[PDB]
Structures are given as structure tokens and as C-alpha cells.
Amino acid sequence: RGSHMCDAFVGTWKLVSSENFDDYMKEVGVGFATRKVAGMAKPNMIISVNGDVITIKSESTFKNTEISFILGQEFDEVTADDRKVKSTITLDGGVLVHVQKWDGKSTTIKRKREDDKLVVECVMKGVTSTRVYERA
Numbered sequence: 001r002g003s004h005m006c007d008a009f010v011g012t013w014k015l016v017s018s019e020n021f022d023d024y025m026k027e028v029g030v031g032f033a034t035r036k037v038a039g040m041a042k043p044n045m046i047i048s049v050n051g052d053v054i055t056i057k058s059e060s061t062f063k064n065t066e067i068s069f070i071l072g073q074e075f076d077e078v079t080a081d082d083r084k085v086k087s088t089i090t091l092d093g094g095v096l097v098h099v100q101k102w103d104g105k106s107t108t109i110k111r112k113r114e115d116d117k118l119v120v121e122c123v124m125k126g127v128t129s130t131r132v133y134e135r136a
């Protein structure tokens with residue numbers, strides 16, 4: 001019950017830049033209207049740890065959601081775009097790797113600290129979106 005290295009992710013984060021998000025979304029299969037409304041949002045992301053359980057929440061004009069999970073242990077997740085997926089989050093040397101699977105597809109969201117930023121890379125097949133957060 002002392003420090004985690006994940007206690008580098010802990011806190012409150014605000015989105016400060018987005019690249020290629022619409023394309024990432026299209027590749028995922030997100031509908032037009034949802035893409036438009038989601039891409040406008042400037043969420044905060046709140047990350048906390050309590051023993052082995054990591055919680056990530058979004059505070060967003062698009063959708064307020066939360067996930068709680070244990071590294072390496074699969075869980076059910078209903079995404080903001082209303083996909084029902086099976087997810088697993090692991091820590092691969094400093095990077096939090098979030099894999100979502102549904103209908104024989106998958107997408108990977110990687111989150112890592114760089115300088116004072118938390119960089120989120122969303123990947124679907126060959127399309128990558130980079131979403132950059134700073135401390136709130």
C-alpha cells in the first residue's frame with residue numbers, strides 16, 4: 001500500500017490538443033452525429049488508484065463515464081459511443097495499454113506520461129489519433 005509507479009498518472013487532466021480524432025472515430029465505426037459531438041468535447045480525465053484498483057473517469061460535455069479495473073484483468077466496458085466491448089488494461093513499461101474488443105474488431109488506447117503531459121494514442125488499424133492532456 002505504498003507508491004505505484006502508476007501514481008505518475010494519478011490526478012486530474014484536461015485535454016489540450018487533438019489530432020486525427022475524427023478519422024480514428026470513422027475507422028472505429030462511429031456515426032456522423034456522434035463524431036461531431038464527441039470531437040467538440042474537451043474532457044477532463046481523472047485517474048486514481050486504490051490498492052490494486054485503478055479508476056479512470058471522464059468529465060465531458062459529451063459523456064461522463066467511469067471505469068475501474070485491475071491490471072491484466074478483463075472487464076466489460078460500454079464506450080462513450082455505446083459500443084459494448086471487452087477490455088483489458090495492462091502496464092507495459094510505463095505505458096498503460098487499453099485494448100477493447102468487439103464484434104471481431106479491436107482498438108488500442110495507449111496512455112503515457114511525457115514531460116508534464118499525459119499523451120493518449122488511439123489506434124484503429126492503421127489510423128492513429130493523438131490526444132494530449134495537461135494537469136488541470
Ligand SMILES: Cc1n[nH]c(C)c1-c1c(-c2cccc(OC(C)C)c2)n(CCC(=O)O)c2ccc(C3CC3)cc12
Pocket residue numbers: 025030034038039041042043044045046056057058059060061062063064065066067080081109120122131
Ligand atoms: C468518455 C468520454 N467523454 N467525452 C469524451 C471525448 C470521451 C472519450 C474518451 C475519454 C476522455 C477522457 C477520459 C476517459 O475515461 C474513460 C476511459 C472513463 C475517456 N476517449 C478516450 C481517448 C481520449 O482521451 O479522448 C474517447 C475515445 C473515443 C470517443 C468517441 C466516441 C467514440 C470518445 C472518447
